[PDB]
Amino acid sequence: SNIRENPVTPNNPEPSAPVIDPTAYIDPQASVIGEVTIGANVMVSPMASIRSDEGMPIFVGDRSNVQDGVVLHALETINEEGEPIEDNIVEVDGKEYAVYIGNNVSLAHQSQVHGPAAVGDDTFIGMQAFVFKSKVGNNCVLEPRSAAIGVTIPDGRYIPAGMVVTSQAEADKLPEVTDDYAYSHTNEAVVYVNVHLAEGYKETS
Amino acid sequence: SNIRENPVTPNNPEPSAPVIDPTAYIDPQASVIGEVTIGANVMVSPMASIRSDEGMPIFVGDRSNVQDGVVLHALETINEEGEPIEDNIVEVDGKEYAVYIGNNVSLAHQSQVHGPAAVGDDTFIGMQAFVFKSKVGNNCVLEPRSAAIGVTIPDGRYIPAGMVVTSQAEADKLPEVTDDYAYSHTNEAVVYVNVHLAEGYKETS
Amino acid sequence: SNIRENPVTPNNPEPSAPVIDPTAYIDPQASVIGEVTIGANVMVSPMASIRSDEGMPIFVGDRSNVQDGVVLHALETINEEGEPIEDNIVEVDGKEYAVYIGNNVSLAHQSQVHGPAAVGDDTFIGMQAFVFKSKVGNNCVLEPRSAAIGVTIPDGRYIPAGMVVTSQAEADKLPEVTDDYAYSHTNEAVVYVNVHLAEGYKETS
Ligand SMILES: [Zn+2]
Ligand SMILES: [Zn+2]
Ligand SMILES: [Zn+2]
């Protein structure tokens, strides 16, 4: 099966199985392992790997999409001695996660979000982009091949294609999404299409 | 099955199944979905995802290769009201495509060509490279980790490794492939080898 | 089966099957083809593709890990006339390889090491990184999205995130890993965790 529990390890005494909303579509050629929650109307495409086997949940909110070849994984959040590694945990609305992906988020083809990380609602994570040890705000756009490592990206900003942002001073001066910006409506269009694709693929299973 | 029709959606009233030349080899661990035409002697490697589920064909010409982890997909080409979205369609020799990959093209490991896009004959798209909203001419080389977004790359030019080209003014001044250039013969060698690999893999199926 | 022989080709008269230590874990959704040797306690994750079908071995040393979406492949090492192509072969401790990955090496998610290439022991190859026609020394760190093409990286150096190193003069001046460097202990932690994950996954098969 391609939806599987994580294994018993010294960091993980009890296996967990994914919790997947019945309206989500998981492609048979995707892999989803371990302590993962997938929300309503989410589409998970071929060759995506969502793997939560080092402690703490990976959460994917409602109406989000995880496109072909995307990887979600996280650094260990509990060491062998049972002690939580706080640097590797993100907090969102009072709850702790290894990776938090909000609602209406698009993780486009071949991107990767590696914990600890949080991605706020209505954000587009572009093709081949990379997010690690970062909090990306709501209504952001990471253009293709951009990256955010070790930073907080404020709400409503974009990272131009190819730019690798590693310092908070850079992140603070990113440009704002405006109506005339080329990707200002991209996420809404991609979310709308993927919610409908998920329903269509569900009707073929 | 890993060769599948696309689903019924408001953008797609009729499912299409891939049209695959009998001399092509599709690895069992690749995925090919929807309105896709694959030409003669094409090799499609493990973990590639070719997904045409938003309207309009993805075409892969003869003696081309789609290597491991490559993704081909396209933006919607027909909106819900049945109206063709012309910005998201490319025209090649009088016919419309979402993605057109010409003959003798190598899409090397982990690259991605996302529609609307066209790639001309005898072009090497290097490892981890990215092409989106662009027309790449014939006899071009995209070195590893290069990208072309929103531009036309003239025939016979190369993009140096890691360079992300987003403006026509940059694309117009790219260097020319010459006989002494390090990748001048790379594509021909890779095509020759892959045509023979496709035949060898076909003999094991 | 996902562990397979390579095909007969003019460059390869005799098919080879992978040699895999009994303590290694190969995920059912990984692909391993051809002349590959995998050492003890190695973990190969979903969607990785290790493909040795153009001559010469791909070797992965003990306690190394090949994470999700990683690709290992190599340029042809024997031409049709049976003549070895020496430029495409690396030598390590008196033996020839297409790709050599040493012991305790982490190939992190979505990275790629393409032959000819060698990666020395205790080196971290970061997420989405790329190594081609290069020798990476021991105790190195390639940060996420870095690349080494056509160079030798001296022992104990790191490449900052996003940097693409293509000239020996650049490689010679890379910074040194020190105890205070942010990734100085990353590989040891990742190796330790993955050796335990491999054992846990083996207990579920
Ligand atoms: Zn990881
Ligand atoms: Zn797409
Ligand atoms: Zn290759």
Side-chain angles (χ1 to χ4, degrees):
Chain A
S1 185
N2 65 318
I3 295 165
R4 304 160 54 183
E5 300 180 346
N6 49 21
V8 175
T9 68
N11 306 281
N12 187 63
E14 298 284 9
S16 295
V19 174
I20 302 172
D21 190 280
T23 64
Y25 174 72
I26 309 305
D27 193 83
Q29 287 177 279
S31 178
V32 182
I33 292 172
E35 195 180 348
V36 174
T37 297
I38 291 182
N41 301 295
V42 164
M43 162 93 180
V44 178
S45 293
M47 314 307 171
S49 183
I50 301 174
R51 183 158 65 92
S52 187
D53 54 4
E54 309 198 8
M56 285 272 133
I58 290 180
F59 174 96
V60 177
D62 297 332
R63 298 170 304 273
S64 293
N65 53 85
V66 179
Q67 294 176 23
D68 317 61
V70 167
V71 174
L72 301 178
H73 188 243
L75 295 176
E76 61 197 317
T77 56
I78 303 288
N79 69 19
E80 284 185 282
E81 307 176 354
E83 296 180 338
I85 308 177
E86 294 296 350
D87 284 325
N88 287 347
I89 294 168
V90 297
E91 188 264 1
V92 182
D93 301 334
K95 296 179 61 185
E96 296 179 337
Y97 300 90
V99 173
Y100 178 87
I101 304 297
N103 308 306
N104 312 311
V105 170
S106 299
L107 300 183
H109 318 274
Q110 297 179 327
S111 66
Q112 171 175 169
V113 176
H114 197 285
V119 177
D121 288 5
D122 304 290
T123 284
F124 182 76
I125 298 300
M127 294 90 176
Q128 296 187 345
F130 177 66
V131 175
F132 176 43
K133 292 184 162 184
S134 290
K135 298 185 177 182
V136 179
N138 323 298
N139 294 289
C140 287
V141 173
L142 261 68
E143 290 186 11
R145 273 281 191 83
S146 61
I149 303 171
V151 297
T152 293
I153 307 296
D155 297 339
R157 303 296 180 91
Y158 69 89
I159 304 184
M163 181 182 307
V164 176
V165 178
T166 54
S167 86
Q168 192 55 48
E170 295 185 272
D172 285 343
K173 297 192 170 177
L174 292 166
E176 269 185 3
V177 175
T178 57
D179 180 60
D180 59 280
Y181 168 54
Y183 293 84
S184 62
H185 303 134
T186 299
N187 195 60
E188 195 171 355
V190 174
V191 167
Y192 184 82
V193 166
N194 275 272
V195 162
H196 287 80
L197 279 173
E199 175 58 359
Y201 279 111
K202 287 289 266 189
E203 292 176 358
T204 79
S205 317
Chain B
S1 185
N2 65 318
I3 295 165
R4 304 160 54 183
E5 300 180 346
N6 49 21
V8 175
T9 68
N11 306 281
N12 187 63
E14 298 284 9
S16 295
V19 174
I20 302 172
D21 190 280
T23 64
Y25 174 72
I26 309 305
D27 193 83
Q29 287 177 279
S31 178
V32 182
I33 292 172
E35 195 180 348
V36 174
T37 297
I38 291 182
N41 301 295
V42 164
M43 162 93 180
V44 178
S45 293
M47 314 307 171
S49 183
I50 301 174
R51 183 158 65 92
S52 187
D53 54 4
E54 309 198 8
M56 285 272 133
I58 290 180
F59 174 96
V60 177
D62 297 332
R63 298 170 304 273
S64 293
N65 53 85
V66 179
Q67 294 176 23
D68 317 61
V70 167
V71 174
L72 301 178
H73 188 243
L75 295 176
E76 61 197 317
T77 56
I78 303 288
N79 69 19
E80 284 185 282
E81 307 176 354
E83 296 180 338
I85 308 177
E86 294 296 350
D87 284 325
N88 287 347
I89 294 168
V90 297
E91 188 264 1
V92 182
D93 301 334
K95 296 179 61 185
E96 296 179 337
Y97 300 90
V99 173
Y100 178 87
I101 304 297
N103 308 306
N104 312 311
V105 170
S106 299
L107 300 183
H109 318 274
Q110 297 179 327
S111 66
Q112 171 175 169
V113 176
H114 197 285
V119 177
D121 288 5
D122 304 290
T123 284
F124 182 76
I125 298 300
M127 294 90 176
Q128 296 187 345
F130 177 66
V131 175
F132 176 43
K133 292 184 162 184
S134 290
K135 298 185 177 182
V136 179
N138 323 298
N139 294 289
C140 287
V141 173
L142 261 68
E143 290 186 11
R145 273 281 191 83
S146 61
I149 303 171
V151 297
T152 293
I153 307 296
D155 297 339
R157 303 296 180 91
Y158 69 89
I159 304 184
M163 181 182 307
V164 176
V165 178
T166 54
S167 86
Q168 192 55 48
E170 295 185 272
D172 285 343
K173 297 192 170 177
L174 292 166
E176 269 185 3
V177 175
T178 57
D179 180 60
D180 59 280
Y181 168 54
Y183 293 84
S184 62
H185 303 134
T186 299
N187 195 60
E188 195 171 355
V190 174
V191 167
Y192 184 82
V193 166
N194 275 272
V195 162
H196 287 80
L197 279 173
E199 175 58 359
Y201 279 111
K202 287 289 266 189
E203 292 176 358
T204 79
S205 317
Chain C
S1 185
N2 65 318
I3 295 165
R4 304 160 54 183
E5 300 180 346
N6 49 21
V8 175
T9 68
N11 306 281
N12 187 63
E14 298 284 9
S16 295
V19 174
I20 302 172
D21 190 280
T23 64
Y25 174 72
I26 309 305
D27 193 83
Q29 287 177 279
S31 178
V32 182
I33 292 172
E35 195 180 348
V36 174
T37 297
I38 291 182
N41 301 295
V42 164
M43 162 93 180
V44 178
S45 293
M47 314 307 171
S49 183
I50 301 174
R51 183 158 65 92
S52 187
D53 54 4
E54 309 198 8
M56 285 272 133
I58 290 180
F59 174 96
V60 177
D62 297 332
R63 298 170 304 273
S64 293
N65 53 85
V66 179
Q67 294 176 23
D68 317 61
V70 167
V71 174
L72 301 178
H73 188 243
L75 295 176
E76 61 197 317
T77 56
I78 303 288
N79 69 19
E80 284 185 282
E81 307 176 354
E83 296 180 338
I85 308 177
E86 294 296 350
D87 284 325
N88 287 347
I89 294 168
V90 297
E91 188 264 1
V92 182
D93 301 334
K95 296 179 61 185
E96 296 179 337
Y97 300 90
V99 173
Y100 178 87
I101 304 297
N103 308 306
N104 312 311
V105 170
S106 299
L107 300 183
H109 318 274
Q110 297 179 327
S111 66
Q112 171 175 169
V113 176
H114 197 285
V119 177
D121 288 5
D122 304 290
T123 284
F124 182 76
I125 298 300
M127 294 90 176
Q128 296 187 345
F130 177 66
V131 175
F132 176 43
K133 292 184 162 184
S134 290
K135 298 185 177 182
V136 179
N138 323 298
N139 294 289
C140 287
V141 173
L142 261 68
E143 290 186 11
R145 273 281 191 83
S146 61
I149 303 171
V151 297
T152 293
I153 307 296
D155 297 339
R157 303 296 180 91
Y158 69 89
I159 304 184
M163 181 182 307
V164 176
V165 178
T166 54
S167 86
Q168 192 55 48
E170 295 185 272
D172 285 343
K173 297 192 170 177
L174 292 166
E176 269 185 3
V177 175
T178 57
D179 180 60
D180 59 280
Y181 168 54
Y183 293 84
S184 62
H185 303 134
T186 299
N187 195 60
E188 195 171 355
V190 174
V191 167
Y192 184 82
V193 166
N194 275 272
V195 162
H196 287 80
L197 279 173
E199 175 58 359
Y201 279 111
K202 287 289 266 189
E203 292 176 358
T204 79
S205 317

